[PDB]
Amino acid sequence: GSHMLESSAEESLAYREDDLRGRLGKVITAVPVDGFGEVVIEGIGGTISKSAVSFDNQQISYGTTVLVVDINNGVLSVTPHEPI
Numbered sequence: 001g002s003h004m005l006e007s008s009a010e011e012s013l014a015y016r017e018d019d020l021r022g023r024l025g026k027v028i029t030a031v032p033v034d035g036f037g038e039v040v041i042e043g044i045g046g047t048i049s050k051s052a053v054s055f056d057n058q059q060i061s062y063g064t065t066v067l068v069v070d071i072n073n074g075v076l077s078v079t080p081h082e083p084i
Contacts, residue, residue, distance in 0.1 A: 014073055017050075021071045025078060027052065031060040039066060039076055051075045 020041050029038035031054045039052035042065070054060055055069045055077040070077035 017073070018071050020076070021068050023068060024081060024083065025052075025066050025068050025076070027060050027064055027066055027078070028062060030062060031078065033057045033059050036075075039068070039078055041068070052078050055079045 024042045025039040026042060026044065027037060027039050028049065029052075031037035031039075031052050033054055034057065035054070037052050037060065038049055040049045041047040051074055052060075052066075053075060056079040058079060060066060060078065060080055064080050065082050066078040067081040068076050068078050
C-alpha cells in the first residue's frame with residue numbers, strides 16, 4: 001500500500017502549492033503571451049521556484065511582480081499585478 005501513501009503525499013504537496021494561489025510572485029524566466037517561463041512566490045527567503053504561464057495572454061519579462069491567479073502541478077498561471 002506504500003504507493004497510495006506516496007500518492008497521498010504528492011496530492012498533499014499539490015494542495016500546499018494550490019495554497020500559494022492566494023499570493024504574489026516574481027518572474028525570473030520570461031513568460032510570453034502563449035508560452036512558458038519561471039516564477040518564485042514573494043517569500044523569496046523561504047520558497048522554491050516553479051514553471052509559469054501567462055493566464056491573461058500577457059508578455060511577462062524577468063523582474064516583475066505577478067499574481068498567481070491559477071495553479072497546476074509545478075506549472076503556475078500568473079499575470080503582472082505589479083502592486084505598490
